[PDB]
Amino acid sequence: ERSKLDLIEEVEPLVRTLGDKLRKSMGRMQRELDTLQQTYELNDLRLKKNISM
Amino acid sequence: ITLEKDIKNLKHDINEKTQINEKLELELSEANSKFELSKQENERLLVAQR
Amino acid sequence: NSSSGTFKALSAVFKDDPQIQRLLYALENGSVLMEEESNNQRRKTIFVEDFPTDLILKVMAEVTDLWPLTEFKQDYDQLYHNYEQLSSKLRFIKKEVLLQDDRLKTMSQYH
Amino acid sequence: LIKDCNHDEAYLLFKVNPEKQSVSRRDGKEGVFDYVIKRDTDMKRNRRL
């Protein structure tokens, strides 16, 4: 029961806090993702245009 | 007894300044998150314009 | 000394690498008051997110190793799948976008 | 006096060593098990002295 109490009042709050932090980090990296995609579109258009003329 | 009262009052001051520091650290993490979100949003807008 | 047995066990089983230990300390109280490596030595706070995502993933993987219960194991499986899907897709995106921005630079020298 | 454990819960909570047939917490935290067994072994060794 002491191990269970660690799981639900020590490991459980730790894992919930890790869950919120990792979900905020997932949001962080999908914003890194779409900003890197937007730079991708920038370089792709710049390359295609400059090669075009 | 006076020194014990001083220790208690200074521990209360320690707790108050620790609450202030916790608020400051929460505001610093919030500032980091707000910087990231705001600069990426501005990057999105500016890149759409580009 | 006041840390719970969870972080104590995690630190003990982890190597004495300062990076991982400082990550654990920051996780225990939000941020790490690390000592500046510059000649102007001073204490500065560093957030958990400043640590690389891979180290945090390894920490939580170790946590699931020491607590392998089915809900935790499934949560780690889902989060690691999201890791290797989203962040790793972003990782090929990042490496190939450094390469393709180098292509842009070569183009800009070209025309 | 003696209740059988859920084998799933016991296995997840406890590392089992069949070579010595011992039981420990997976996190390695010392419980009454470690205290009792360590005390017994220390008495055995002090007797060996």
CB pair distance less than 8 Å for A36 and C94: yes
Identify the burial level of A21 via C-beta atoms within 10 angstroms of its C-beta, where 0-12 means exposed, 13-18 middle and 19 or more buried: middle
Helix (H, G, I), strand (E, B) or coil at C108: helix
Residue C20's Cβ-side half-sphere holds a number of Cα atoms within 13 Å equal to 17
Helix (H, G, I), strand (E, B) or coil at D16: strand
On whether any CB of chain D is under 8 Å from the CB of A1, the answer is: no
- A11 vs A8: CA distance, rounded Å: 6
- Alpha helices by DSSP H, listed for A1-53, are 2-6, 12-52
Q: Counting runs of H as helices and runs of E as strands, what totals does chain C give? A: 5, 2
Experimental structure resolution, Å: 3.2
CB pair distance less than 8 Å for B33 and A39: no
CA angle, C99 as apex, C105 and A37 as ends, to 5°?
95
- Residue identified by tokens 């993987």 is C61
Nearest chain C Cα distance for residue A33, angstroms: 6
Residue A21's nearest CA partner among D43, C50, B23 is C50
